[PDB]
Amino acid sequence: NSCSMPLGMESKAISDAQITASSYFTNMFATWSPSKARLHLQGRSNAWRPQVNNPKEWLQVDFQKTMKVTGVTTQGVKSAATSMYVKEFLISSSQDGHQWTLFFQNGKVKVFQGNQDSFTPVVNSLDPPLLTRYLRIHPQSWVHQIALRMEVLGCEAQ
Template identity: 40%
Template sequence: PLGMESGAIPDDSITASSYWAIDHESYRGRLNGVGGVGAWAARTNNFDQWLQVFLGMVNHVTGTIIQGRHHHNDQWVTSYKLQYSIDGISWKTYTGNNGSEKVFPGNNDRSTPVTNLLVNHIDARYVRFLPQSWHNWMSMRVEILGCTMNSKFLLKA
């Protein structure tokens, strides 16, 4: 995990297209987070909404974990796409082996984490979750799986 749940990724590195109100902010979107209303919740339910994580340095991203809203209401994302960027300006959408944009399966309830591993890792400083379908409302908590590109490996000849 790259630091959403642990808090290694700072609150100000987690942004979103919008949020519903106080206690629904982007930084509430940490896996297993219980603060506020227990998730990031978008202001409106449409395909223009996203939750974005700035990883700082370039990382090898190998997967994601998502959850629904912790308490109050039954709200979760049932499918999503991933976008990624090095500079935060030029974005690519993750594609499957067939070259088309991959739609990942999401949650069936608000508490069970759903892990999706990437067939091909991506190198990114920014990762965006783009909800494509949801139950009741667009609310989510996330983690990003991977490792830093500056990880040292010992190779034997």
């Protein structure tokens, strides 16, 4: 129970450089960049959104070391009056950036059940816990548009 602390998305101990994505939506007034994918961030473009909405987009955190990951927390966003949130997602991970592993639950790729609105954070436990350096989230279903603010829960790999 001693390995459930936020690893730094909300606090910015995970720096902007550490968060990347397949793509992200940007125009003259908005940058829905990967580094906006931070739990409870407020503002005009306060979430990651991919450039196009499709099930092959992804958001990635690089912890810059191997960490013990025991949960992921996700949250949608509101763009003015429009609610946008991910309902279902997959996770993949890597210790070196070369070899990736899809997150399985007892022999089957786990489909995580995510958000049901644009504001409530949903915590998804990872059992078994992940010892990883890169963590990728793969949205599979969503309401209106893909949008993510997140936190990673865990501890150092000691």
